[PDB]
Design an enzyme around this catalytic site. Structure first.
Site, PDB file in Angstrom:
ATOM      1  N   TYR A   1      -4.319  16.525  -9.931  1.00  0.00           N
ATOM      2  CA  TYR A   1      -3.729  15.414 -10.612  1.00  0.00           C
ATOM      3  C   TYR A   1      -2.482  15.848 -11.355  1.00  0.00           C
ATOM      4  O   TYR A   1      -1.408  15.288 -11.249  1.00  0.00           O
ATOM      5  CB  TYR A   1      -4.668  14.791 -11.603  1.00  0.00           C
ATOM      6  CG  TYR A   1      -4.075  13.613 -12.336  1.00  0.00           C
ATOM      7  CD1 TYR A   1      -3.952  12.379 -11.745  1.00  0.00           C
ATOM      8  CD2 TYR A   1      -3.644  13.738 -13.634  1.00  0.00           C
ATOM      9  CE1 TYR A   1      -3.433  11.312 -12.428  1.00  0.00           C
ATOM     10  CE2 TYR A   1      -3.109  12.674 -14.320  1.00  0.00           C
ATOM     11  CZ  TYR A   1      -3.011  11.438 -13.733  1.00  0.00           C
ATOM     12  OH  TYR A   1      -2.508  10.363 -14.440  1.00  0.00           O
TER      13      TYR A   1
ATOM     14  N   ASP B   1       0.918  -1.153   0.000  1.00  0.00           N
ATOM     15  CA  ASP B   1       0.000   0.000   0.000  1.00  0.00           C
ATOM     16  C   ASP B   1       0.946   1.189   0.000  1.00  0.00           C
ATOM     17  O   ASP B   1       1.408   1.608   1.068  1.00  0.00           O
ATOM     18  CB  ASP B   1      -0.818   0.007   1.294  1.00  0.00           C
ATOM     19  CG  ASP B   1      -1.845   1.102   1.318  1.00  0.00           C
ATOM     20  OD1 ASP B   1      -2.708   1.178   0.425  1.00  0.00           O
ATOM     21  OD2 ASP B   1      -1.840   1.922   2.246  1.00  0.00           O
TER      22      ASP B   1
ATOM     23  N   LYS C   1       1.264  14.590 -10.758  1.00  0.00           N
ATOM     24  CA  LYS C   1       2.085  14.042 -11.845  1.00  0.00           C
ATOM     25  C   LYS C   1       3.266  14.919 -12.207  1.00  0.00           C
ATOM     26  O   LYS C   1       4.333  14.413 -12.599  1.00  0.00           O
ATOM     27  CB  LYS C   1       1.190  13.529 -12.941  1.00  0.00           C
ATOM     28  CG  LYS C   1       0.336  12.298 -12.696  1.00  0.00           C
ATOM     29  CD  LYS C   1       1.093  11.152 -12.045  1.00  0.00           C
ATOM     30  CE  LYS C   1       0.466   9.803 -12.220  1.00  0.00           C
ATOM     31  NZ  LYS C   1       0.943   9.048 -13.438  1.00  0.00           N
TER      32      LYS C   1
ATOM     33  N   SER D   1       2.893  10.447 -16.706  1.00  0.00           N
ATOM     34  CA  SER D   1       1.734  10.881 -17.462  1.00  0.00           C
ATOM     35  C   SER D   1       1.933  12.130 -18.311  1.00  0.00           C
ATOM     36  O   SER D   1       2.819  12.953 -18.217  1.00  0.00           O
ATOM     37  CB  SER D   1       0.536  11.075 -16.504  1.00  0.00           C
ATOM     38  OG  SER D   1      -0.459  11.805 -17.193  1.00  0.00           O
TER      39      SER D   1
HETATM   40  N1  LIG Z   1      -4.712   4.861 -17.774  1.00  0.00           N
HETATM   41  C1  LIG Z   1      -4.331   6.077 -18.273  1.00  0.00           C
HETATM   42  O1  LIG Z   1      -5.015   6.591 -19.162  1.00  0.00           O
HETATM   43  C2  LIG Z   1      -3.043   6.634 -17.666  1.00  0.00           C
HETATM   44  C3  LIG Z   1      -2.356   7.693 -18.237  1.00  0.00           C
HETATM   45  C4  LIG Z   1      -1.090   8.105 -17.791  1.00  0.00           C
HETATM   46  C5  LIG Z   1      -0.602   7.636 -16.576  1.00  0.00           C
HETATM   47  N2  LIG Z   1      -1.351   6.660 -15.914  1.00  0.00           N
HETATM   48  C6  LIG Z   1      -0.871   6.151 -14.617  1.00  0.00           C
HETATM   49  O2  LIG Z   1      -0.956   4.691 -14.551  1.00  0.00           O
HETATM   50  C7  LIG Z   1      -0.891   4.344 -13.159  1.00  0.00           C
HETATM   51  C8  LIG Z   1      -1.973   3.359 -12.791  1.00  0.00           C
HETATM   52  O3  LIG Z   1      -2.280   2.559 -13.977  1.00  0.00           O
HETATM   53  P1  LIG Z   1      -3.815   2.820 -14.513  1.00  0.00           P
HETATM   54  O4  LIG Z   1      -3.901   4.259 -14.847  1.00  0.00           O
HETATM   55  O5  LIG Z   1      -4.127   1.781 -15.493  1.00  0.00           O
HETATM   56  O6  LIG Z   1      -4.548   2.519 -13.101  1.00  0.00           O
HETATM   57  P2  LIG Z   1      -5.380   1.358 -12.401  1.00  0.00           P
HETATM   58  O7  LIG Z   1      -6.412   1.993 -11.518  1.00  0.00           O
HETATM   59  O8  LIG Z   1      -5.839   0.420 -13.457  1.00  0.00           O
HETATM   60  O9  LIG Z   1      -4.284   0.565 -11.478  1.00  0.00           O
HETATM   61  C9  LIG Z   1      -4.742  -0.155 -10.301  1.00  0.00           C
HETATM   62  C10 LIG Z   1      -3.684  -0.788  -9.425  1.00  0.00           C
HETATM   63  O10 LIG Z   1      -3.075   0.225  -8.571  1.00  0.00           O
HETATM   64  C11 LIG Z   1      -3.924   0.382  -7.433  1.00  0.00           C
HETATM   65  N3  LIG Z   1      -3.428   1.181  -6.304  1.00  0.00           N
HETATM   66  C12 LIG Z   1      -4.016   2.263  -5.781  1.00  0.00           C
HETATM   67  N4  LIG Z   1      -3.323   2.733  -4.756  1.00  0.00           N
HETATM   68  C13 LIG Z   1      -2.261   1.956  -4.628  1.00  0.00           C
HETATM   69  C14 LIG Z   1      -1.171   1.936  -3.736  1.00  0.00           C
HETATM   70  N5  LIG Z   1      -1.064   2.841  -2.773  1.00  0.00           N
HETATM   71  N6  LIG Z   1      -0.238   0.982  -3.874  1.00  0.00           N
HETATM   72  C15 LIG Z   1      -0.333   0.051  -4.830  1.00  0.00           C
HETATM   73  N7  LIG Z   1      -1.342   0.036  -5.679  1.00  0.00           N
HETATM   74  C16 LIG Z   1      -2.313   0.971  -5.601  1.00  0.00           C
HETATM   75  C17 LIG Z   1      -4.633  -0.909  -7.202  1.00  0.00           C
HETATM   76  O11 LIG Z   1      -4.084  -1.666  -6.089  1.00  0.00           O
HETATM   77  C18 LIG Z   1      -4.192  -1.797  -8.390  1.00  0.00           C
HETATM   78  O12 LIG Z   1      -3.155  -2.624  -7.828  1.00  0.00           O
HETATM   79  C19 LIG Z   1      -0.907   5.689 -12.412  1.00  0.00           C
HETATM   80  O13 LIG Z   1       0.423   6.293 -12.408  1.00  0.00           O
HETATM   81  C20 LIG Z   1      -1.742   6.529 -13.404  1.00  0.00           C
HETATM   82  O14 LIG Z   1      -1.626   7.891 -13.027  1.00  0.00           O
HETATM   83  C21 LIG Z   1      -2.482   6.076 -16.520  1.00  0.00           C
END
Ligand SMILES: NC(=O)c1ccc[n+]([C@@H]2O[C@H](COP(=O)([O-])OP(=O)(O)OC[C@H]3O[C@H](n4cnc5c(N)ncnc54)[C@H](O)[C@@H]3O)[C@@H](O)[C@H]2O)c1
Ligand SMILES: NC(=O)c1ccc[n+]([C@@H]2O[C@H](COP(=O)([O-])OP(=O)(O)OC[C@H]3O[C@H](n4cnc5c(N)ncnc54)[C@H](O)[C@@H]3O)[C@@H](O)[C@H]2O)c1
Lengths: 285, 275
Positions: free
Chosen positions: B155, B65, B159, B142
């Site tokens: 956000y 976490d 980031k 991001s």
């Molecule tokens: N999906 C997009 O469009 C996009 C764009 C750019 C950056 N990101 C970045 O991708 C990352 C996450 O991937 P996503 O966007 O597919 O998200 P997601 O919600 O699909 O990822 C979920 C995972 O991270 C979670 N999580 C939340 N708090 C947590 C913590 N404290 N420790 C561990 N896990 C935690 C859940 O446990 C799960 O393990 C983040 O940095 C998000 O800002 C995503």
């Protein structure tokens, strides 16, 4: 007076100076609400004020702890004219040291004050300027919000976080007539850094010998930069002032072209590899 | 196996796809410590990995976490190998909306998870790397960490906090053999009314609507993002940034072109609000 300015972080430095410049300004234009985190530390602002003879009533202090969202709410109601012409975001905290040697409490007050603090600030005060469709927000920048500085990682994220927040709200604020402007400053001579360094021991116990080594090297480099390039708080004062004055304000105001080149190199190299090279080189040779 | 990787947020998205891809790489070389916030959400991982043919032992899962220094410590303590060749800082949270409509708690959680959570992993993990004088840190960045976005201030600050934080270690770490890199991403598949004023309200709704159109236009697959992580991971000279796409390169280059931030603000205001 008549333009109502409110500044956060005034018992010293940029806040103090920005405050008394304005309260003293000859055209008797603004009424300045110099807010301090803890009102007991205000004697310096007061003498400052007397030293430049701010006419009576051009300045009032208030208690504003950017950490305290009620404290913010509280300041606000104490603003008699029911408006804030220019709201200056200035309270800051520094944090210098080997990444793995910083206290958890400390990474969290830096981001609480630096980032959450401007957030709570703008949240309380932006709404009403949007209504009136007039309003000015000034936010103390740092070169450290534009480019990364070895051993100032946490500080750097907050300064960087501040450009994230600002350019983001700027795009939305355009049409309201509320103008947001960050005031990027290079090193300023204020003892913002005096409040920033743990002692050799701390550092020593907290990190590796190699890293322990790189830190004094930076430290000695930075000092030299300091002593060779810092500006005076009054100089920087003047920069809010111009931006403040300008009728159609840009997002950024530089207090110095000093680092300009370097800010360009960056922008010119998207892999971010070139900048890293230099900085590294300039800081540790 | 041998390249021990530790990756956050892996029950879905990029964490899930990066975790397994690695585990199933054909050179049978990474050991994957996929970690999740709630282990009760780990089916798809195992399902993915089971469905993907992964060397027995190649994958394992721990409960981390990033908001809990102590939970960070134990995960660390569970890496039997003793080193960490690749630490993948990936856990993130979005926050969307009229700034004066965002609650203090939402605001502090996004700063805790996105920013304080990468500080924690890094301080849990960089010292050992420094020692070995070896170790790659890939960080999930991001687009919104690269430039301002209406109704995404917190956000974007989180980031943008990531960039400076990483940009900062990138300079120091140079000499110790460690490398840091952000995999900059675009959209990836997988109270208001009371707290704000009319005009702000409509923009907000206008923004949303357009934004869901563009995500579907833009959004790539995790499969694709993990492929950029992987490339990066094999770079002998891995840069500070890697990009999963060039849709946002123009805008990027615009921003770096007018230091006062004016053009961008206009371009972008224009882009989200046409008229
Ligand atoms: N999906 C997009 O469009 C996009 C764009 C750019 C950056 N990101 C970045 O991708 C990352 C996450 O991937 P996503 O966007 O597919 O998200 P997601 O919600 O699909 O990822 C979920 C995972 O991270 C979670 N999580 C939340 N708090 C947590 C913590 N404290 N420790 C561990 N896990 C935690 C859940 O446990 C799960 O393990 C983040 O940095 C998000 O800002 C995503
Ligand atoms: N000193 C430099 O070289 C330098 C350079 C560029 C930008 N800055 C920024 O300028 C600002 C002021 O720095 P300075 O150089 O005047 O240092 P300073 O410490 O002399 O002044 C900072 C002021 O805000 C502070 N503050 C800290 N916590 C606060 C809280 N919880 N509530 C309200 N105020 C709080 C201090 O009390 C002080 O009143 C900060 O944003 C700082 O990061 C400083």
């Amino acid at each position: 007076a008549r333009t109502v300015v409110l500044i956060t972080g005034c018992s010293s430095g940029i806040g103090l100076h920005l405050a008394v410049r304005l309260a003293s300004d000859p055209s008797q234009s603004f009424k300045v609400y110099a807010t301090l985190r803890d009102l007991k530390t205000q004697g310096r602002l007061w003498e400052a004020a007397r030293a430049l003879a701010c006419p009576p009533g051009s300045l009032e202090t208030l208690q504003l702890d950017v950490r305290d969202s009620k404290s913010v709410a509280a300041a606000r109601e104490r603003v008699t004219e029911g408006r804030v012409d220019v709201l200056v975001c200035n309270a800051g905290l520094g944090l210098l040291g080997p990444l793995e040697a910083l206290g958890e409490d400390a990474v969290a007050s830096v981001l609480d004050v630096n980032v959450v603090g401007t957030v709570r600030m703008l949240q309380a005060f932006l709404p009403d300027m949007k209504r009136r469709g007039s309003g000015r927000v000034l936010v103390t920048g740092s070169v450290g919000g534009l480019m990364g500085l070895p051993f100032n990682d946490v500080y750097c994220a907050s300064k960087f976080a501040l450009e994230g927040l600002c350019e983001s709200l700027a795009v939305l604020l355009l049409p309201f007539g509320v103008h947001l402007s960050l005031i990027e400053c290079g090193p300023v001579h204020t003892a913002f850094m005096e409040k920033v360094l743990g002692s050799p021991e701390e550092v020593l116990d907290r990190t590796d010998i190699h890293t322990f080594h790189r830190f004094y090297q930076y430290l000695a480099l930075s000092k030299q930069v300091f002593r060779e390039a810092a500006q005076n708080p009054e100089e920087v004062a003047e920069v809010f002032l111009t931006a403040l004055r300008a009728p159609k304000p840009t997002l950024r105001y530089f207090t110095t072209e000093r680092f300009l080149p370097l800010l360009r190199m960056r922008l010119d190299d998207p892999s971010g590899s070139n900048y890293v090279t230099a900085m590294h080189r300039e800081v540790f040779g």
